[PDB]
Amino acid sequence: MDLKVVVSLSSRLYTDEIAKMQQRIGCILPLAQNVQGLGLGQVYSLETVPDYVSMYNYLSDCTLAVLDEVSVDSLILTKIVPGQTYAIKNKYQPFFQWHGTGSLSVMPPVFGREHATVKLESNDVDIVFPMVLPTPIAEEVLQKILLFNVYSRVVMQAPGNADMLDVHMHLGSVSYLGHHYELALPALLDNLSLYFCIMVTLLPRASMRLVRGLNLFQEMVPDEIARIDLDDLSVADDLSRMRVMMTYLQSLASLFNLGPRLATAAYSQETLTATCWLR
Amino acid sequence: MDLKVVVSLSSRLYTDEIAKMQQRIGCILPLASTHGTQNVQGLGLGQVYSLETVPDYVSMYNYLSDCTLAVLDEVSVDSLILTKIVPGQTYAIKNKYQPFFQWHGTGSLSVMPPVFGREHATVKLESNDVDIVFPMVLPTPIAEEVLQKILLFNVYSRVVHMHLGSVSYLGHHYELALPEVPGPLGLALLDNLSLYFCIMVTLLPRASMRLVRGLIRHEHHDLLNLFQEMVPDEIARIDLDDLSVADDLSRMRVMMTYLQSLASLFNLGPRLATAAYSQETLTATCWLR
Amino acid sequence: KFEVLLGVYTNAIQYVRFLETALAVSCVNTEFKDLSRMTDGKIQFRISVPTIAHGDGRRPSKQRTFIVVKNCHKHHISTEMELSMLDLEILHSIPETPVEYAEYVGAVKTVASALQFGVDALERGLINTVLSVKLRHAPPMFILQTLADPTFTERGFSKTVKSDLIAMFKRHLLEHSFFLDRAENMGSGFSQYVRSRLSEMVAAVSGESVLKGVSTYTTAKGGEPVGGVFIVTDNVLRQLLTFLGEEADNQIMGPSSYASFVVRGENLVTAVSYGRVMRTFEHFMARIVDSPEKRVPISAAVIKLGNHAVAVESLQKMYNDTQSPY
Amino acid sequence: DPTFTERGFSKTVKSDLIAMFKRHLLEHSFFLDRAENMGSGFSQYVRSRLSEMVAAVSGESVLKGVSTYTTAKGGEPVGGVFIVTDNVLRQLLTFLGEEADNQIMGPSSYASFVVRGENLVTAVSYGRVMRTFEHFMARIVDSPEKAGSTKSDLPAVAAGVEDQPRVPISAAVIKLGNHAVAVESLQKMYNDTQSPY
Amino acid sequence: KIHPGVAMTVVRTDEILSENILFSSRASTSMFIGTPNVSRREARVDAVTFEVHHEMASIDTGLSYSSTMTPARVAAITTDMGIHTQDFFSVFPAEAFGNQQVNDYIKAKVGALCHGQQATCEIIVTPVTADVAYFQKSNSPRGRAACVVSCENYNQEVAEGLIYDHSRPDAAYEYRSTVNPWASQLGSLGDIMYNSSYRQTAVPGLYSPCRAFFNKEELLRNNRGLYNMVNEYSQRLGGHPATSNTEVQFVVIAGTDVFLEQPCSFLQEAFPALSASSRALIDEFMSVKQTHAPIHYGHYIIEEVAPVRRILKFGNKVVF
Amino acid sequence: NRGLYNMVNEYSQRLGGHPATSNTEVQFVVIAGTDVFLEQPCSFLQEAFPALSASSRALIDEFMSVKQTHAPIHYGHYIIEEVAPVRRILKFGNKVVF
Amino acid sequence: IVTPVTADVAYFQKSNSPRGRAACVVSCENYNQEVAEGLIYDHSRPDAAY
Amino acid sequence: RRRLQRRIAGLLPPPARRLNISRGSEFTRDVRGLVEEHAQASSLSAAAVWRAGLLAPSGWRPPVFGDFLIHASSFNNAEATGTPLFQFKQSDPFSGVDAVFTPLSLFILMNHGRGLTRMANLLYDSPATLADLVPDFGRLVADRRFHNFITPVGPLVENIKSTYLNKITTVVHGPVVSKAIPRSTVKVTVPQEAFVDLDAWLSQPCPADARLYVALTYEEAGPRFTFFQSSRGHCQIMNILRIYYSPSIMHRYAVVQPLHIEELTFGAVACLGTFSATDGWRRSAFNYRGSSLPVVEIDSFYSNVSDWEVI
Amino acid sequence: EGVENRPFPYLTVDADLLSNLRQSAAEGLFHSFDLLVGKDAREAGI
Amino acid sequence: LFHSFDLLVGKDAREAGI
Amino acid sequence: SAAEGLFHSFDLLVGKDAREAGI
């Protein structure tokens, strides 16, 4: 069908802007037509605090678009449908090889704002493209930035229990299919880390309420340090704790579903593109 | 490709029933079969949600997951015509549901069992002895908290419950009916959640307890308001251990897979991905996610 | 040393037709088709029953008219025919070599055996929906041995005549049900009991009905108009010809009403009969050449029950060729 | 009996069919010595027990339209034989009545089939002979656009059965309603060889 | 084998394949044959799936009844006519006793698949002073006869009284109010077991015969007109249906494929089966069909009446 | 345990299971099977039929007297009427039952 | 065949199997080892007749 | 050229209908053509089946294909067409060979180290080279990360023969059909003892289609491969297979050590594709030179491979 | 299962050999048969 | 009269009609 | 309504010799 979506650029684009838009022409980006909220650039603006979860919810709510052609006044781009496929390319400056992986994950770029962006001086907007990366790399960088945020805030509060070089030796590198990448580890990622923290703190009393809902079978599998909490807590506090914990558990589970998960068939490393459909 | 179901009545639809069905045009209806001509006895959600038995919503969720979905376009005498929902086509779905949730954010919708009551969407046929109930279509941020209220009422029947009984929205509060017993399959989902929790409680990390301890004693966030400035002792006796990275990294990989499995468990019912919702026309161009 | 193919065979699908069977005795096929065009499915009749002018000073015998509304039943009959796409790829490809001409003739024969499947499926679905209409408005005989007897009704449906009518239903449920089983355990009176029961059905069915006309569906031997039709199974059809023993006509009926469906009914069935499918596909093949250069006897055993000569037709063969239950 | 086979043979239909087997074996087996229990209706009982025997047999075969055997009195096909012993033949030619016909009109020679010039090439070459290669050539080479009807393919089903002289052969014909079966015994063929029938 | 304080009233519904006969007089319904039309439905890359649609209007001319459908003969009794009773531990799996040690010992002393349908028969608790003369004729399995069809249409308030208000006597036996009060009353034991108001935790797929006698929603369905309750009989109601060939009896999920009609839901009376109290009265029922004693001092025999006259054989002594 | 038509097929096509030697003195299971043609429902449906068993000679001389009003069970004895598919004439003196 | 004296005579006045359980031929199943053998030998289930 | 023109002219999209709203006499003949187009594209005739072949380019989608470069000794020429192939992830970045497995050569990767086994070791007699293809089977099944290194690539539709360095082509996503324009249907062949129907173990709504799921599962003796056919969804068949995996939750209980994370996962389920539910899977028999194993035949396959989700 | 499906010229007999066919093929009266429903019911490719 | 109600009601004007 | 069972043979236009709208 007719799928060519154009966006309204106010000012004409100069030569270096044309080159920087040509450099990443194969990548995908979301959509809100306005060039102001054209992508993820309104969460990564200097206007809001760079919070991960609102960025993820906006990225999973709104549609995606892979752009085909660039001009001095127009941006030819086709939005994503669940029906057919589009040929997309890996044009991200943190380069992850899409060798034979059947899935691609679309997440906000956690490797720094400058690494995946184009800054438009002449226009009103500074656009960003999300990270399209294979899903074991996606869950691995989620692990190694989540645990690094935890093990960093801990040594900011108390540096007597852990070591910063000990967590930076392992939690700064991912190793998928023999490729060894390095993680730009510097704020960011604090609300997701504290969400996970609240979940694993209130999950003991959650598991106790669940096993008391329906006996020693499910009470043997906790260890002795994982079993003992005293049986005295208020009704309203317990109910609000369970409700807020299950809310954060549902949001955290749908968040560790990595969003719009793209799928690929034929990765051609000579031309750096793969036939990509929405799944 | 003809995508059009002509569900035919046996008996004559009276004029008030024609008005009540013409009031509901564009709403989601689940079908029994995907074929071109069907019967009414089997149209809708009434075969799983009957008046005689308890409202069990988890089997209704799996019914809405399994069977096909159709929108209602034309209603006339002796017959009402539906349009199926296939992937690859954009459908117009209007908000004609009685607990009104405004779709201002154009969020992804969700198809629900009628948890808010039967009798507002019960729409009754006195032609033939059948009751057509229309599933609730509503965004997934409301849907997760409605599903958690359904799952939490059964475990808080034993031990304020009006907060769990009703729903929370930006503009209004609506009352949704809870049963005293969930049912067999709701108890099965609660049992699977209990086994998941009683297994995953030992596979929890140790480092984030030091974070919550130093953050309680140091700096109150808006998110740290639930503890009422108190820490339990289980946190302390799991913080009598020293922190390493290897067992925590393996534990966070199995925690990633377990949180993906919980994402598989909570995601019940169909979801619709909206695009270009019109608030003035009150319909939304949607497709199946 | 060879491997003999001893012959190769296929079955001829019999062309059933709704106006050929005797189920269309109980239906009049109007050529109006405006009640499909009409928005509401009702039709209003101003019927007017007579009255007995009474003479005693009880009440004045006012005239009787009834404005009755008959709702029409619209049924939707739908089959499907999954047809392969590489049959279409030969249908559009013009053949030149004799092997692809044989393959194209095979593709046309596969297509013309699917349009014929659709037409043969909508002349069995039509009989099926008509027979299910006549089985939905068919109250049982243990009700209408008494509800169609006016010596109990018409005194006014009070509580007492209904309370006695239910207890009269419960007698005919026991001493009258399965009447062809009591006739096997009867004595020498095989025929008179079965003839009495069939005549009691014809008497309890036949009453007042709107929209009458000419004597339609006559028989050929006697020339008597046919009152109804006894749709039976094949075993009951075998049993009602050794109990009753004979037939009034030699399975021949003479409806002159089947005169506008020997034209409108044939130019669909013979329009897919592979003489016109091959013709229209040769026509479209010539377009592809053009492209780059630029009354009757009805088989129905008729029995005579008193004064009405009803027909007895069994559609068991129609349903056993589907492997569908009768 | 198609009213018991109209639905599929479920675990429950294949139970009451096994019940009905034993019921029919207890009740209606040995129909000829229990015909002596009555004296008046011997003929009607034997006629009904043979007329319910030609109806259980599916006589619908592909060689039904090929008229190969006819009754010598009037033109009507036979429709099968009963093969009985000599005693049951002696009881079924008096109680069922004297035979309507004494002889049937059947063929006089085997309808031969030889591997001729078109099938010899595929016998020697492939080892696959077909029956009536000339009718395959008449159907798919010479006008394949003419699809065969019932009547147009009747001289092809009757391969060599029709073109024969028809001598009459003696067989006691019994008319069971509309059918005209031809009962006979072969015990004269077995008793002089000293072998059991 | 010692008598408990109560007796029972075992109710089974027995299916029958019956060869029917349909009369329908000429010019009964007028018809309008629409022209048939084709449309593709599932245009798969492997094979395009068409559809051939057809519509027709059948307008009923006759203001009387222009058809009668009688059962001509029984083909076979498709059910068991057996003894297989209902398991309430399968219908009500959420209910249990106090001790799980005594609640598991119970489920062990009772039931915690070959041949035809077992005819799952319910059980109604009924005192031992219920006269056998009530059970020797077709009645309701509860005490009161439910003559609600005789009363005035669309009047639920008065017609609940003739079913449940025991201040007035029976429709049949006007010298008693009910032959058992433990099932015939509004909140009684037979009513809390089998009515839909108290079966909210039951398994909906299983089938219970006594739902045709105790369910107040369908008992008041027959309260309407006699010319409406003969329409709603034959108009494919399937109000109280059952599965045809299923090994274990179930209720159908709105089945249009099967063809059945239930006269025990219309006129609300069950027919007595061949019951006895000893084998001796069974052995004397075949010996003398006319001069058999229905009562011998403490034992009874209930000769079966039914629409079907099922023929019994015990050895060679046949009764018709 | 194979399907119905494939049991009907193998019932008549061969001596499907356990025949006895006829025209011998003692019953042997056949090994020849050349001229031994016999059909057998007892392997088709796996049920045996009752014989005329009587616990005492009093009941079996009262079965001949009244064959309809006889007691199948008298106090501790019994008589069992044969229901077998070959109806056999029982003749004790001149009292003939069937 | 050796049976107890408590085998009732109503089993022997009909045409049943000479052992206890009714061995059903096709009424059980089609090509199994746990339903036919179950309905023939497993006495935890009652036989199909009684 | 005349053959080529006669072949292209028939295989051409029909032109779009015009309505000249501006002119008067052109509008009448254009709506005349409009009703003459509908009346012959709707009625029962050969004209309405002639219209279905033009395809008018949403309904039909030409699929994607996977050109895979394999070794000839790791494959067999004598296999059927519709075998769902399973690519193995390679550690070396520049490899060039994508090691795929048919279910029989993967069944000998199952069993060698501990019907199907007869035809498996008849098709792949020497398993030392196939154990040398995978760099680690026992350790990778010991840490239970084998399910993510195995990805399915859909059923084989075209196998061009070569004595060394064979090349295969599978439909990775889309309607499963052959590659040669002499057209045929690629019937998906699945061996029956690995195939189970989930309604059979389940023992009410009619879907649109019945999907096929492969479930690599980690039995305690070795891995196991089972093809699951379900009319339900993916997140529903996760719960249904949670019901089906009854002794696995007892084994993961009876291995009571929780810090050994190997026995806390029990396989993973990947959705292979969607075949129609109104036409069920057909049974068939696949013959070698000597043996014959019963094989599920599945037609009208629409392949769309999903991720492995953990039971 | 022992049956070929070629575009043979099938002779059109008039026998009633549809009666009890879909149930007879299920029980196994036919030793070898092919059921072709949908697109498989075609005069196949030569 | 602008329709074809001749076969629907019947030929006789005293029995049926418009 | 009024035409709940009735056919209509023709209509009566409100003196409009070329207009179809109005009563």
Residue numbers in the entry:
A (entry chain 7): 1 to 32, 38 to 191, 200 to 227, 237 to 301
B (entry chain 6): 1 to 159, 172 to 301
C (entry chain S): 51 to 344, 364 to 395
D (entry chain T): 199 to 395
E (entry chain S): 1037 to 1148, 1174 to 1381
F (entry chain T): 1284 to 1381
G (entry chain T): 1185 to 1234
H (entry chain 5): 9 to 65, 83 to 139, 150 to 238, 256 to 363
Question: What do the study authors state?
Answer:
All herpesvirus capsid shell consists of 4 abundant proteins: the major capsid proteins (MCP) constituting the basic capsid skeleton through forming 150 hexons and 11 pentons, the small capsid proteins (SCP) binding to the tops of hexon MCPs or both hexon and penton MCPs, and the Tri1 and Tri2 forming the heterotrimeric triplexes to plug the large holes on the capsid floor. Once the viral dsDNA genome enters the procapsid shell through the portal that is located at a unique 5-fold vertex of the icosahedral capsid, the viral nucleocapsid is joined by the capsid-associated tegument complexes (CATCs).
Therefore, a penton MCP neither lashes a hexon MCP nor is lashed by a hexon MCP. To analyze the CATC occupancy at the EBV penton vertices, we expanded the dataset of penton-vertex sub-particles with 5-fold symmetry and then performed focused 3D classification with a mask including only one CATC copy. We also identified 37.9% of the penton vertices in EBV are CATC-absent and obtained a reconstruction of the C5 CATC-absent penton vertex at 3.8 Å by 3D refinement. Intriguingly, compared to that of the CATC-binding triplex Ta, the main body of the CATC-absent triplex Ta is rotated ~120°, whereas their N-anchor regions essentially remain the same, which is also the case in KSHV. In addition, some of the penton vertices in both the KSHV (7.3%) and EBV (37.9%) mature nucleocapsids lack CATCs and thus remain vulnerable.
